[PDB]
Structures are given as C-alpha cells and as structure tokens.
C-alpha cells in the first residue's frame, strides 16, 4: 500500500517546485501512473485477503473504491483546468495540493484496519472539500453550503466516536476481523439500540438519507467540478464502507432497528426522483439523482444479504462514474454559458453533435440500460428486497419509471429541441473534455465486461 | 410569420377568419370538389345575406352565435397542410437550420475550400459594422414621444441606408 | 387595408437583400476543393469470419461439456440406428 501512498505524497513537491508550465502535465501523468500501479490490489488468487501491516489491509470491497479514487484524480486535474486558468500559479498549485490530499486520505481510509483511524481520516476529508467549495465557488451561498456540510457531518460523527470508545473499552481492540472472530450477540436493550443509532447516523448522513439530504444539493450546486465529482463518487461511499464494516458487530439488532431507514429510503427514492422532474438546476437534478440512487444502497445494507451487498457495491462504483460524467457534461456547458439553468440552452446536438452522444450514454446508464453495472446492481437490490417483502417491487417500479422520465427530460431539454440561435459564445468542444467523457465511459464498458472485480465480499 | 397582430382584431377580421375556418372545415367534411363548391356557395350566400347590415350590437350577436354553431359543427380531425402547425412536417428541418455565426468557429483548413464563399461573407460584415450606427438613430429619431408604440419598423429614407434590424430577417436559413 | 407604403418599401429592400444573400450562398465550380464484386465480398465478409467461427466452435465450444446440446432426432419404426447396427420393428396392424 505504501508503494501507492508514498508517490501520492511525493506528488506535492513535484507540484510546488515544478515550473509554472509543466506542473499540470507532470502531476497528471504521474497520477495516471499511480492509477496504474494501484492494480496490484487486484491480484487476489485466493479467498484470503491482503494484510501488508497492522495498519493497512485490502479487500474485494476496498480495492475498487481505492482504484476509482486513484483514477478520478487526473480527471479532476483535467476538469479544474479551464477555470482557475487566469488564477495565479500559487493558487492553482494550492488547488492541486488539495486534490492530492483528498486522494491520499481516501486511499488511507479505504485501506484502514482500525475504526478510529478510519474515523480521523473520514473526518479529515472535510478540510480540503470545505476549502475547495468556499475558496473557488462562484456564488455567495457556498459559505452556508460548507457550514451545512461540515456540521451535518460532525453532528453525525461525534456519537460514532463515543460508540467506538465504548467498544474499545468493552472489547480491547477496534481492529477489524478481530471484531469479527470475537463478536457476540447482544441483549436487545435500549443502550444497545442507542449504540446502533450512534454507529449508524454518521454514515446515514454522509450518504444522504431522505430527511438529511439537505447538504448534498447545496454542496454540488455551489461547488466547482472537481469537488462535485469527488463528493458524488467517493464521499457518498465512505458511509457505505463504514456501515458494511460496522454492521458485523451490531447483530441481531438491525433485524428490527432498521425498518425506519428502509422506509425512509424507499420513500425518499420516489420523493427525489420526482424532484428530478421539476428542478430547474441541472446540478441539483443530478444531486437528487445521486440521492435516489444512494437510497437503494442504504436499504440494501440494512437487509444484510449477499445479493444485496453485491448490488450495493456495483451501484456504488457505477453511480460514482456516471455522476462524475454527468457533472462534467453540465460543466462543459456552464463554462460556455455561465448558467446552470437547463431550459436556457437547448437545441444542442447540432453544433455539439458528438457530446450529444456522451450526454446520451450517461443517460442510458443512469436509467439502467442493460448490459450495465447500474442495472446489475439495481436488479439484485430489487430481488433482495422482494425476498424481504414482495411489496417493495411497487416502489421500485415507480422509481424506475421516474428515472426513465427525468433522464430523458435532461436529455431533451438540452440536446433534442431547436437551437437558441442567439448563443454566439458556443466555443467548440475541447479535446480535453471529450477525453474526460471518454475516460469516464470506457471503464464502465470494461467493468460491464468483467464484473467479477466489482461484486464484493460475498461473491 | 412576417408581421405582428394588432392590439385588437376588428369585427371585419373576426368575420373573415371565421369564414376561412368554416370553409376549411367544410372542405374537411366534404371530400369531393363538387360537394365542396356546392356547400361553399351555400355558405357564402348565408354570409352575404347579412353584409349590408350595420347595427353593431346585432352583428356582434350574430357572430357570437355563429362561432358557437361552428364549435358545434366543426370537424375534429381537420386537414392541416404538412408544413403548418399540426402538420406532419411542422418544425422538421429545424435540425438542419443551423445559424450563420456557426462559421466563425470553423478551422482554416475547412474554409480553405469554399474560399470564394467566405470572401463574400467577409464583406457582408463590412456592410454591417458600417450600417449599424445609423440604424439606431433612425429608430431614436423616429420614436413616438407620446408613449404609444407597436411592433412595426420603418424602411430607410436615403441612398445607402438599409432597413433597421435586417441582419436576422436577411441571413436566415432556407426552409427546404 | 394592404401594405402601407412604408411596409412596401421595407419589404422591397429586405427582398433585394435576401435575393442577394442567396445568390451569394450559391457557390462556384472547382469547389469544394479536395486533395466479381459479389465474389470478393463473399470471400472477405463470409469466409474469413466463417473460418474464425469454425475454429472457435470446434476448439472452444465442443471441447466443453454442455455448450452445444442438441435435442434428440425423431425416430420412427423401421429407422435402423447406426451407432449400434440396430433395427426397431414396425407397428401393429392398422384397423380399417
């Protein structure tokens, strides 16, 4: 793992003592080489897992998150490049350093073994995100957005820390797989119910539950494109990783202390897919899409079945890639029109006839067009919840319909009408952003061809 | 598609448009030309029977009743010419109606062909940055200071001046 | 009431301008500047693919147990099987 972290740490000097003309190039190339080297983790020839130290470890669930994290970096580098172009060399080096720090901390917290290290890193992920969102946003509500994000997270995270201490005291360690080989059943008492609540709310907030989803749309709409991408792809996954790791000891409480969250997820799914029909901001639309998709992940972790966890992992990675792609697609226009309003610009696919394809495929994925991992996840979540109770299929179908509606709405109100001929400032498509979209898509094709790397722990 | 409605339609215009719609729906109902001519002559007789009348109140009443008769006897699937609203070709070539400014982004190796074309496009601009300032004054100076205003536009009264606000009525794409 | 004279002059001017825009949108010659069949198609679009497909089948789809599972062939009385040199006898006397 250290062969992955040390070079990521060295990307910093490179960034600062690189000349003002080659820093972007060099750091991007080496970030790509890091993404390449990270594939050592995929050499899993046995059911035994990796353990490089007492402090690090890798699993079939942490490896894909780690590789997606190491892959998204150069894409964010490329995407944060047109803006902050006039900004000073020092400022853009600061930006690059923020990105690299996020990379390193996310890799660490995915490769961690101890819940408290996981905690300090899952809570150190705030500084760079807050700084990016507040120092490089364009509106005046980015400050309130950072407040919301930061404090939702911390209010959810404190009781988690307290529960971790309670455990570290009852048991003598917070180490994973020891917390597994020594776990006991519980007494189904109110103290342990509150322990459950504490352990869970942090992650149920970091991946937006229906009722506490009021930090994601803000952060997205007010944040730059790299912040949007990382928030949509990985910061929404820290909660899933944490719950998949902490739910092993809370048995057998989640059999009955999970109903409220299953209900909230299955309902907010509909109640956000519907907002995706009547929202005017493209970015907020995609945010509510992310919410409606993470609801499935939540409801699937809650029921604790192998198919459920498999679908959760598949959909996690797939939604990461697809949301990053959609955000970058909307950014391509924003850079040209400086307005997130969707119905303003229309009739594209005439001057941008190719980007209308990327727009289309990112939509084919979000609406779960087979063969695709979005669907290979949704289907198995649906089957697991149908075994749970057969009446979930109703809400699942409603959500499917609304998704197929608002995806094509987003397509047609931007690319499939007639042009706003009064738009003189439609600079043709950059090779850079076409490459962004291609780098987002192709890995989805490859993971659809080899979805054995994406099932997870159970499979 | 070339003018703007007036602040209010006059009784004459109302009656004329009612006549036109009534005849179009008569065509829709009667598929054969002989029948169409027969009943069109009948309808025009019905109309002319009240052309030399002047009582405005009774006229408006006859019109309010004829419009109801029309709504009650109208064909619900009338004939619409293809390229017109409701027709099977309305807004069909808007996909190929690309504007003119889309050529300012072309690449030298693209306008390298059609060189004789792009030379004209150039001097068509020279004919625009010069003909702009005087198109404003002609509007400023021809303004009604009594508040009243409508969607009309004047021509140019000189040798060399051009109609104000022409670039978009000129330069627009073919229909094809 | 027809076109007022100002409208008529407006339309005449826009007309003489559009009939020039279109004459210009016309283009000269010498521009845009620029710098057996059944059998050959059969070969290059059927045979080569057919060779690849026969290879794939014969050596990666019939070497495996249950990849090509044909149904059983109809057999009727008198049909003498060949994998055992056998002969099944005919049916009974048909009443009529």
């Amino acid at each position: 793992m250290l062969k992955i972290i040390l070079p990521s740490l060295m990307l910093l000097p490179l960034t600062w003592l690189s000349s003002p003309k080659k820093t972007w190039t060099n750091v991007t190339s080496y970030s790509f080489l890091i993404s390449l080297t990270s594939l050592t983790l995929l050499w899993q020839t046995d059911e035994n897992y990796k353990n490089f130290s007492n402090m690090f470890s890798s699993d079939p669930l942490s490896t894909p998150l780690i590789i997606l994290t190491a892959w998204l970096l150069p894409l964010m580098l490329m995407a944060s490049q047109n803006h902050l172009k006039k900004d000073n060399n020092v400022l853009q080096k600061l930006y690059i350093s923020m990105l690299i720090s996020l990379q390193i901390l996310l890799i660490m917290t995915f490769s961690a073994t101890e819940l408290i290290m996981f905690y300090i890193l899952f809570e150190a992920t705030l500084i760079p995100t807050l700084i990016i969102i507040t120092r490089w946003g364009n509106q005046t509500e980015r400050l309130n957005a950072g407040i919301y994000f930061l404090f939702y997270t911390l209010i959810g995270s404190i009781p988690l820390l307290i529960a971790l201490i309670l455990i570290q005291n009852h048991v003598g360690t917070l180490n994973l797989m020891i917390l597994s080989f020594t776990t006991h059943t519980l007494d189904a008492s109110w103290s342990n119910n509150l322990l459950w609540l504490a352990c869970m709310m942090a992650f149920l907030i970091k991946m937006p539950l229906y009722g506490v989803h009021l930090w994601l749309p803000k952060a997205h709409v007010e944040a730059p494109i790299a912040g949007s991408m990382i928030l949509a792809a990985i910061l929404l996954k820290l909660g899933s990783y944490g719950m998949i790791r902490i739910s092993i000891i809370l048995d057998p409480l989640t059999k009955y202390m999970a109903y409220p969250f299953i209900l909230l997820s299955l309902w907010g799914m509909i109640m956000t897919s519907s907002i995706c029909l009547r929202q005017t901001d493209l970015k907020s639309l995609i945010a509510y899409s992310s919410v409606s998709h993470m609801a499935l992940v939540i409801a699937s972790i809650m029921i604790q079945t192998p198919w459920s966890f498999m679908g959760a992992t598949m959909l996690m990675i797939a939604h990461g890639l697809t949301s990053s792609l959609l955000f970058c697609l909307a950014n391509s226009n924003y850079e040209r029109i400086h307005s997130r309003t969707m119905i303003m610009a229309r009739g594209l696919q005439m001057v941008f006839p190719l980007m209308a394809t990327w727009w289309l495929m990112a939509s084919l994925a979000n609406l779960a067009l087979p063969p695709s991992i979005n669907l290979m996840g949704e289907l198995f979540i649906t089957m697991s919840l149908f075994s749970w109770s057969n009446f979930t299929i109703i809400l699942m179908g409603i959500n499917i319909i609304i998704t197929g509606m608002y995806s094509m709405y987003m397509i047609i109100t931007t690319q499939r009408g007639k042009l706003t001929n009064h738009m003189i400032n439609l600079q043709p498509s950059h090779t850079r952003e076409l490459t962004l979209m291609a780098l987002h898509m192709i890995p989805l094709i490859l993971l659809t061809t080899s979805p054995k790397l994406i099932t997870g722990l159970t499979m | 598609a070339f003018c703007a409605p007036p602040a209010y339609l006059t009784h004459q215009q109302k009656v004329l448009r009612l006549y036109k719609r009534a005849l179009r729906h008569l065509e829709s109902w009667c598929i054969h030309r002989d029948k169409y001519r027969y009943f069109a002559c009948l309808m025009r007789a019905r109309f002319e029977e009240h052309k030399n009348e002047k009582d405005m109140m009774r006229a408006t009443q006859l019109l309010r009743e004829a419009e109801e008769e029309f709504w009650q006897n109208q064909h619900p699937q009338p004939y619409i010419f293809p390229d017109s609203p409701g027709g099977t070709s309305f807004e069909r070539y808007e996909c190929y109606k690309v504007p003119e400014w889309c050529l300012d982004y072309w690449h030298p190796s693209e306008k390298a062909m059609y060189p004789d074309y792009f030379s004209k496009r150039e001097q068509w601009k020279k004919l625009r940055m010069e003909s702009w300032d005087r198109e404003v004054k002609q509007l400023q100076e021809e303004t009604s200071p009594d508040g009243i205003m409508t969607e009309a536009l004047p021509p140019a009264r000189r040798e060399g001046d051009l109609p104000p606000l022409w670039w978009h009525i000129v330069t627009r794409p073919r229909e094809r | 009431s027809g076109y007022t004279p100002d409208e008529k002059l407006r339309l005449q001017q826009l007309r003489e301008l559009r009939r020039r825009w279109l004459k210009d949108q016309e283009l000269s010659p010498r521009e845009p500047v620029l710098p057996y069949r059944s059998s050959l198609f059969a070969v290059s679009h059927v045979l080569i693919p057919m060779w690849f497909v026969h290879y794939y089948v014969k050596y990666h789809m019939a070497t495996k147990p249950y990849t090509i599972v044909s149904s059983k062939p109809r057999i009727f009385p008198g049909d003498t099987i060949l994998e055992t040199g056998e002969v099944i006898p005919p049916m009974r006397d048909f009443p009529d």
Binding site: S429 | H107, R174 | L27
Partner: peptide, 11 residues
C-alpha cells in the same frame, strides 16, 4: 448547387 451551413466537426 448551393452551400450547406454546418459546424466545424474538425475539433
């Protein structure tokens, strides 16, 4: 013969 307006497509 006439001229068909189109975007760049080179990029």
């Amino acid at each position: 013969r006439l001229f068909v307006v189109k975007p760049s497509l080179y990029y």
